[PDB]
Design a protein around this motif. Structure first.
Motif, short mmCIF file in Angstrom:
data_model
loop_
_atom_site.label_atom_id
_atom_site.label_comp_id
_atom_site.label_asym_id
_atom_site.label_seq_id
_atom_site.Cartn_x
_atom_site.Cartn_y
_atom_site.Cartn_z
N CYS A 73 -0.74 -11.03 4.12
CA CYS A 73 -1.49 -10.56 2.93
C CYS A 73 -1.72 -11.65 2.32
CB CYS A 73 -1.17 -9.29 2.41
SG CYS A 73 0.45 -9.46 1.58
N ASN A 85 3.33 -4.38 -5.09
CA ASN A 85 1.83 -4.36 -4.60
C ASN A 85 1.57 -4.28 -2.96
OD1 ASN A 85 0.52 -3.96 -7.27
ND2 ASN A 85 1.00 -6.22 -7.61
N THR A 140 2.16 -0.93 -1.35
CA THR A 140 0.91 -0.10 -1.80
C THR A 140 -0.24 -0.85 -1.09
OG1 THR A 140 0.59 -0.95 -4.01
CG2 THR A 140 1.75 0.87 -3.70
N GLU A 141 -0.38 -2.00 -1.42
CA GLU A 141 -1.31 -2.89 -0.70
C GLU A 141 -2.64 -2.60 -1.32
OE1 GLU A 141 -0.64 -0.95 2.60
OE2 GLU A 141 0.53 -2.37 3.73
N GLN A 142 -2.87 -2.64 -2.75
CA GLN A 142 -4.04 -2.13 -3.57
C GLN A 142 -4.94 -3.57 -3.91
OE1 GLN A 142 -1.18 0.91 -6.00
NE2 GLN A 142 -1.99 -0.76 -7.30
N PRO A 143 -4.40 -4.67 -4.11
CA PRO A 143 -5.28 -5.77 -4.29
C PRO A 143 -5.23 -6.70 -3.21
CG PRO A 143 -2.69 -6.12 -5.31
CD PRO A 143 -2.93 -4.74 -4.50
N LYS A 164 -8.43 -9.00 1.45
CA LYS A 164 -7.99 -7.72 2.00
C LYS A 164 -6.96 -7.98 3.18
CE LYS A 164 -10.17 -4.13 2.00
NZ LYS A 164 -8.97 -3.64 2.65
#
Length: 90
Positions: free
Chosen positions: A59, A33, A36-39, A45
């Motif tokens: 993050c 994750n 990709t940095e989705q959640p 954010k």
């Protein structure tokens, strides 16, 4: 894909979360994750830092946990930096 590296201060961070409440595989699992940095928590954010050091971004995989790291396209590797909580560390 990008590997996963660890720092010195980082190793001293997890040890504090593992005792209070953390998992080992969680890190190797969250990596998917992080790349990709989705959640990164909708309200949180992920975001850059800027200010002389563009190669630095933090993050928050958990609702109360940060994670500073630095990418190195030179060899496609994910080098972590910090991880935990302000209240936890302090």
């Amino acid at each position: 894909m990008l590997t996963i590296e660890t720092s010195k201060k980082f190793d001293k961070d997890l040890k504090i979360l593992v005792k209070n409440g953390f998992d080992l595989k969680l890190l190797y699992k969250v990596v998917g994750n992080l790349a990709t940095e989705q959640p990164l928590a909708p309200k949180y954010k992920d975001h850059p830092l800027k200010g002389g050091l563009k190669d630095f971004r933090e993050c928050h995989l958990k609702p109360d946990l940060l994670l500073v790291y630095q990418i190195k396209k030179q060899e496609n590797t994910l080098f972590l930096v910090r991880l935990g909580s302000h209240s936890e560390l302090f």
